Ligand SMILES: OC[C@H]1O[C@@H](O[C@H]2[C@H](O)[C@@H](O)[C@H](O[C@H]3[C@H](O)[C@@H](O)[C@H](O[C@H]4[C@H](O)[C@@H](O)[C@H](O)O[C@@H]4CO)O[C@@H]3CO)O[C@@H]2CO)[C@H](O)[C@@H](O)[C@@H]1O
Ligand SMILES: *[C@@H]1O[C@H](CO)[C@@H](O)[C@H](O)[C@H]1NC(C)=O
């Protein structure tokens with residue numbers, strides 16, 4: 646159970662974004678139905694008043710929270726991968742529009758999933774703003790918690806993969822547009838019961854054998870990281 650408080654840009658806290666520049670759900674319950682419109686931007690998708698100014702090459706850091714800002718973020722049981730997608734606000738999430746800018750499942754070195762490291766990072770994980778057309782965008786961050794993904798939701802609706810999904814509104818001002826955005830996958834749609842990473846047993850199977858759901862990370866992506874970039878406690 647977790648949600649996004651707001652964002653930092655190049656290490657600068659942009660202030661509470663909830664229902665302002667983040668299209669927030671009313672609470673931190675997971676999305677589990679794979680065919681539902683809720684897979685787009687969670688249970689309350691609608692244009693909100695504000696959109697954060699950034700430029701290509703900026704570092705955009707999402708900040709997640711559990712109950713209060715900078716609390717314990719998400720419960721330690723929710724082991725799983727983290728992804729960020731982008732789409733034009735044009736689309737409002739609809740159609741074949743979502744391009745993946747980032748994916749992080751399991752790190753063999755430190756033997757931590759992305760979620761474990763997100764807790765350590767005080768809920769902060771980042772992506773570098775790519776060189777796409779200036780304009781308005783949604784950045785969709787998605788945490789897949791797999792603590793019950795040994796089952797499928799379609800077959801047993803009290804279990805299944807859990808999706809904690811949050812769309813930010815981002816306006817990209819300066820960009821040379823060296824990497825124009827391609828068409829993407831739809832949500833709902835790209836994840837189905839048969840898609841890998843959706844059904845997996847983290848209790849019996851080892852985390853190095855985990856393979857995150859597709860699609861793959863767009864070549865025009867400029868990476869990202871899971872790590873604290875500013876102290877929320879100083880505000
Ligand atoms: O640990 C392995 C075990 O996990 C089992 O699943 C557990 C989870 O481990 C556990 O974290 C989860 O806890 C949830 C709880 O069910 C929710 O009711 C609670 O929701 C709160 C929310 O936390 C608050 O922020 C909000 O204000 O109110 C809501 C409503 O009360 O959130 C916590 C997580 O933070 O419970 C699961 C039980 O299904 C698996 O079932 C098992 O297979 C694994 O072995
Ligand atoms: C899942 O979502 C679809 C589309 O909204 C819905 O019609 C269906 O009733 C939902 N499935 C379950 C199992 O609740």
Ligand SMILES: [Cl-]
Pocket residue numbers: 646
């Ligand atoms: Cl949960």
Ligand SMILES: [Cu+2]
Pocket residue numbers: 646647675720723
């Ligand atoms: Cu939860």
